[PDB]
Design a protein around this ligand. Structure first.
Ligand SMILES: CC(=O)[C@H]1CC[C@H]2[C@@H]3CC[C@H]4C[C@H](OS(N)(=O)=O)CC[C@]4(C)[C@H]3CC[C@]12C
Ligand SMILES: [Zn+2]
Length: 257
């Protein structure tokens, strides 16, 4: 039932998922001047050398690239995290136009899109158990601006024609997510939630300061995806972002001065 439209979008989600009005909801506006530099924060450890991508899927809300998370092959550690988080999938949020699409904002600035690399804490054994824990998930968030192409994204863009509508999936092996990362791992971090139903308050957010640049042609291909299933009225998969939620009693910490 839930989606991003007038009648089922973010302003409606609290009816099925009352935690939507909870104390640690995501995304948020990152007020860069209010974020506290924390010299105690460790550099983020991103270990993706042995990542095994499996499939690419249109779930009717985004598309995701799924990984083998049955072993510690692609893990996030350090930064604000205690222990080891396995990469499950990455997906994106994007806009109908370049001036919107990101879920996090930076001083109220919206980017064209936001990449989420979703990881779960191995101490909880499976992602279903991890989403029931306040430190279950770590999501690495990367902003996309429009300019030069990101060569590492092109393999993703080129298969989207094969998963146009909700339910479609394809083999997507040997995709290296290191090709999606910016130079700097400087980050902001805060305790938050999933940004779609069920909006579980299980996420340590790690949002990189440095955006990646993608081309207009790359993001145009995201906008050709469909929310609808094949044979239903065509509704472009655009504006699949939740707006910024109240920060309430939280502190955003910066890894950098
Ligand atoms: C209730 C469940 O079975 C959980 C276990 C794993 C969860 C998924 C983990 C991956 C995240 C990514 C994502 O969240 S985000 N934007 O905060 O990274 C959309 C929700 C979704 C699909 C989650 C939906 C709820 C799932 C399926
Ligand atoms: Zn997301």
């Amino acid at each position: 039932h839930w989606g991003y439209g007038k009648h089922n979008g973010p302003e409606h989600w609290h009816k099925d998922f009352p935690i939507a009005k909870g104390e640690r909801q995501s995304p948020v506006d990152i007020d860069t001047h209010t974020a506290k530099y924390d010299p105690s924060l460790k550099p983020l450890s991103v270990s993706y050398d042995q990542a095994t991508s499996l499939r690419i899927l249109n779930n009717g809300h985004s598309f995701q690239v799924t990984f083998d998370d049955s072993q510690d092959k692609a893990v996030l550690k350090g930064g604000p995290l205690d222990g080891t988080y396995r990469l499950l999938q990455f997906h994106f949020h994007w806009g109908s136009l370049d001036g919107q699409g990101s879920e996090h904002t930076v001083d109220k600035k919206k980017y064209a899109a936001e990449l989420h690399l979703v990881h779960w804490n191995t101490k909880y054994g499976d992602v279903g158990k991890a989403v029931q824990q306040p430190d279950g998930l770590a999501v690495l968030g990367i902003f996309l601006k429009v300019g030069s192409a990101k060569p590492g994204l092109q393999k993703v863009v080129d298969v989207l024609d094969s998963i146009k509508t909700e339910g479609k999936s394809a083999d997507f092996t040997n995709f290296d997510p290191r090709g999606l990362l910016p130079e700097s791992l400087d980050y902001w971090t805060y305790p938050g939630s999933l940004t779609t139903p069920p909006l579980a308050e299980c996420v340590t957010w790690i949002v990189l300061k440095e955006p990646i640049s993608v081309s207009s042609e790359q993001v145009l291909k995201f906008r050709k995806l469909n929310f609808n299933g094949e044979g239903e009225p065509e509704e472009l998969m655009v504006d699949n972002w939740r707006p910024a939620q109240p920060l309430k009693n939280r502190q955003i910490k910066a890894s950098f001065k």
